[PDB]
Amino acid sequence: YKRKRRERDWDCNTKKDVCIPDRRYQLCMKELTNFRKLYLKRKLIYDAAVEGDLLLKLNNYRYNKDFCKDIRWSLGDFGDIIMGTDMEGIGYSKVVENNLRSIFGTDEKAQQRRKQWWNESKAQIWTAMMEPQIYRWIREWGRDYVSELPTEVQKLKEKCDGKITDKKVCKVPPCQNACKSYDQWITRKKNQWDVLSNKFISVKNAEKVQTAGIVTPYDILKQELDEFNEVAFENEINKRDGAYIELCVCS
């Protein structure tokens, strides 16, 4: 039972260094909370089963790019927990990390064993549902903003339009509430990209990152989607774009 997306946004309050998507919050690890390596592949295969199955029902049983995205981000989230590279750990996702420790060992080399095991298993686990963690979350946040933009602008066009030689954004009570409601969205989206983009730089710079196809937080959305413009994205998120001036500015 995965709640419909855009019913919960990325929460930057729990960990203020990085914002966590709600999809990762609802990641089903329940069996991982209960040689051992082959014993661990089974417990993880159930969680990889339920998860990939529920996300499809969340997708209205449809086969489309949106579904393959939800499987992909959910797949990599598993690796970050199994490798110990997960930045989400809060509540019982800390418990999974501690469970895998006594299973994989805590030794200095044992951090290297986790990667090897997830290197072979990943080709399997992927089928059971049907790159650094921050790099993936910029791909997911990017797909959020592009499908959340036309809705907010649409809800605004209904309540604010027409010269009724001045705009409805002054003297019309319903429109002035609609404009502030837009402010909340574009504010959260701005404060989000603030936190998340720094986590991209604090990783790429502090850890050796061999992927040079993305040197900037902008480059992720540039390779993820087509009609993305670097300039326009800056204006929209700063509320200076040629829309939010024509709606919500009375002068």
Epitope: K159, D161, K171, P174, K180, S181, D183, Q184
Partner: single-chain antibody, 228 residues
Framework: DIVITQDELSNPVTSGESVSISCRSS???????????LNWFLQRPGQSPQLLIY???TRASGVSDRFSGSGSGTDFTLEISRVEAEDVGVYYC?????????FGAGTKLELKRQLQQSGPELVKPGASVKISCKAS????????MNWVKQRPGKGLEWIGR????????HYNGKFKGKATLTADKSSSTAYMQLSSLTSEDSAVYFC????????????WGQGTTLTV
């Protein structure tokens, strides 16, 4: 200036006897989005206003399911089914089509058988006394603080509203010069300083938090008694 008027309840209402209060505007309360903007409140005999029904039929959370919001968009009606002794009081409507926000005269009812507002204030004529409204919620920066003027034995007069986030102000034309609407952010406190007092100004004043997302006035204060 939009006209609003309500009817009077002629006979004392027996408990459980149903009833319907009717509201009539002078203008279509529908909007460009095809939504009828309207509200229905109830003031307990001794309490602050409480929202019941908003956006025509849509019910307010916490309000009993037996209050109906029907309307044709210039003609609206509430409905009290199996009326309760708690509901005895005065009911008001609100219309959002354009400023000023106008609350109707109100309809009586018979029994047949939060926000921190500043304390009372008594000052000479021609004075100015700021009064506060303290909202503990962090929505104070994201909400609309509305101010309301309750004269003794009278309906509601909307003074204006201020949004602490961008510091916007909407002023009722009547009070255009008599109101000073500020807001404290750091302590999340709203302030209203009335200009040089006239004897007419003696009345209780209420603040109403409006969610920027719904837009109903759910949260009201204990009141502020002002005396000349």
């Amino acid at each position: 200036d939009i006209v609003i008027t309500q009817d009077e309840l002629s006979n004392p209402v027996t408990s459980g006897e149903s009833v319907s209060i009717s509201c009539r505007s002078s203008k279509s309360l529908l909007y460009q989005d095809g939504k009828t903007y309207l509200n229905w409140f109830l003031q307990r005999p001794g309490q602050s206003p409480q929202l019941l029904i908003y956006l025509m039929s849509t019910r307010a959370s916490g309000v009993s399911d037996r209050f109906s919001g029907s309307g044709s968009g210039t003609d609206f009606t509430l409905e009290i089914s199996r009326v309760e002794a708690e509901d005895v009081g005065v009911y008001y409507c609100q219309q959002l089509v354009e400023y000023p926000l106008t609350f109707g005269a109100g309809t009586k009812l018979e029994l047949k058988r939060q926000l921190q507002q500043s304390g009372p204030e008594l000052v000479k004529p021609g004075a100015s006394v700021k009064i506060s409204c303290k909202a503990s919620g962090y929505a104070f920066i994201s909400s609309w603080m509305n101010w309301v003027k309750q004269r003794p034995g009278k309906g509601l007069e909307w003074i204006g509203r201020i949004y602490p986030g961008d510091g916007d102000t909407h002023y009722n034309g009547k009070f255009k010069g008599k109101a000073t609407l500020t807001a404290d952010k750091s302590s999340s406190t709203a302030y209203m300083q009335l200009s040089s007092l006239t004897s007419e100004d003696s009345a209780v004043y209420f603040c109403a938090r409006e969610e920027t997302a719904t837009g109903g006035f759910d949260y009201w204060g204990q009141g502020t008694t002002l005396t000349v």
